[model samples]
Target: ELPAPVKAIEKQGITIIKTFDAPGGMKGYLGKYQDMGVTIYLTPDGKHAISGYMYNEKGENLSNTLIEKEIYAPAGREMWQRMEQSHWLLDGKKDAPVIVYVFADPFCPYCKQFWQQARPWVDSGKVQLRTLLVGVIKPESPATAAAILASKDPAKTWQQYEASGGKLKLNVPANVSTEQMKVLSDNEKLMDDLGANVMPAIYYMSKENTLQQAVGLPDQKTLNIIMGN
Candidate 1:
């Protein structure tokens, strides 16, 4: 998914930009956009011109606009690009048809509910999902932080976490010393870099790298469209 800034501009119209590569990389982008086909032309120097227009059935131009912007910023690209590479772990197969990324707190009850209901899809091999241990919600709980850092096997940890049905375990390491706190603080900074402060942010990206995000729990219909089911 394209990483939108934690701060967003209130835009009234379409945003058009040309790029040498797809703005979302080789992967496509699925976000709130006009169904009208969009085109971007890029030059060899990694610069390009972009044009967006509303068209009619006969391929007639109804309305259009041209804008110039650098599609990639070093900060924005580096943060999420790292997320795209290091954080996603496939459960069933290396290429499991569909891939999703989620940023979550280990103690968030709502996130647990999402896992419980979506567990069937993960189990049946219809899709693959990964969770980044983000502490936006439970910054006060050092134990939650340490346990997540300690729990390298996220798949097993998730099962145990959800199975407990909201009851937290005391045995897991929860304390974070001053040094540990600084380390985790740095980790959370990347979340700010990715421009996300919300818990349970989920994004779906296609094999071709098209990105679609559901900021909250999506209904079944929206889920189907994202999975291509």
Candidate 2:
């Protein structure tokens, strides 16, 4: 149970994950704010919550040590859980050891380039991809996204759509079913909730085992890192 002062910060949107001892009889908290680690210290008087690093008498930093050990990897795991729960089309090997998530729109050229660029890792069975379709790119984007997602097999359908530069079928009104539109909306909301307002928002676990984001098509260096090299 958190003390009143610590609980107050939680109500303000910092999710407290663990508590530890703070110097000079204060209570220390490890938490995440906007998915980034944030440290807070509760005063011994039980009246204040101080946010930021803690220091001992030697003036040595201490809060970061706990955050590094407790927060970074855990935050990534939390993000992975939400991605796993969202509606998405799968690409590459189902059991691949590394997985990447992308918020993509059918009409986005960058998304296509990213798709093609992933071929090396995907074809080699080194990485799997989950493409979450969000139709905010153009007026006709919803129809195209629905058409691709509602196809008999989205894996093959989306693959062909990307490979053929989205010419496999007309992007005309596909008469999206309520259920199909709902899936699209849900995925769109997830994109928004994750703070991506653009097409081709890429997410993957970094080499340091922390969640990392790449907006638009990645450059060569980032691409190499994203592919788990």
Candidate 3:
């Protein structure tokens, strides 16, 4: 039988997939909230719920640590698999051991910054960056994205386009096929479904083999942490 609070959690758009009993009559609920996986607790009588951290006398957050390992890590791996199946352009070595997916927009300056920052690792053939382009910032974005995908050599074309400051005057062939445009639109929907509305959103597998995501251009120190350096 399901507890009553499960209904409330579902009402908040969270899907409660499993429940477990803890010490002192507390119940733990494991579930997914849209693109994020979460774990929450119910009190002894199953009447009250707790959403955040639970601390010990030493002030360590026991609940957070548990959820990070049990729930978030697994969910991140699953999301990584899903993202891998999305249609995107591949930059860097095909046989690179590390794979990173970038939700990019040609018009986003931050996206360009991240691209430049990643050049070293990419050029060294240690990583493969998948560029999934979506146009959300400006009216010309969609057309520019289509222009990129339609190019004979998208990777080089992207580099050149970025080198030119993503200028609108870059002549795009009129024959950028309808099928190519459809792919760009699909990429946009995929980004939305992943709950990453920000440009230059990045997803990569950590050194520990867990999946992780970054919302914007990460600094070098943060990048090293994520890259497991």
TM-score to true structure, per model: 0.57, 0.71, 0.67
Model 1: pairs clashing at backbone N, Cα or C within 3 Å: 27-208, 27-209, 28-209, 28-210, 142-174, 143-174
Model 2 agreement with the true structure over 144-193: per-residue lDDT tens digits: 88888777887788988899987787444438989889989998887887
lDDT of 3 by residue, 42-99 (tens): 8887787765566878997776666567766676765777677777788889998888
Candidate 3 off by > 4 Å: 1-69, 167-170
Better of 2 and 3 by TM-score: 2
Ordering by TM-score = 2, 3, 1
Candidate 3 matches the true fold with a TM-score of 0.67
lDDT of 1 by residue, 95-175 (tens): 666766766666677667666657667777877776666556655545675564566674565557755764656346546
lDDT of 3: 0.76
Computed on alpha carbons, the lDDT of every model, listed in order, comes to 0.52, 0.84, 0.76
Looking at model 3, which ten-residue stretch has the lowest summed lDDT?
162-171
Clashes of each: 6, 0, 0
The lDDT ranking, best first, is 2, 3, 1
- What's the lDDT for candidate 2? 0.84
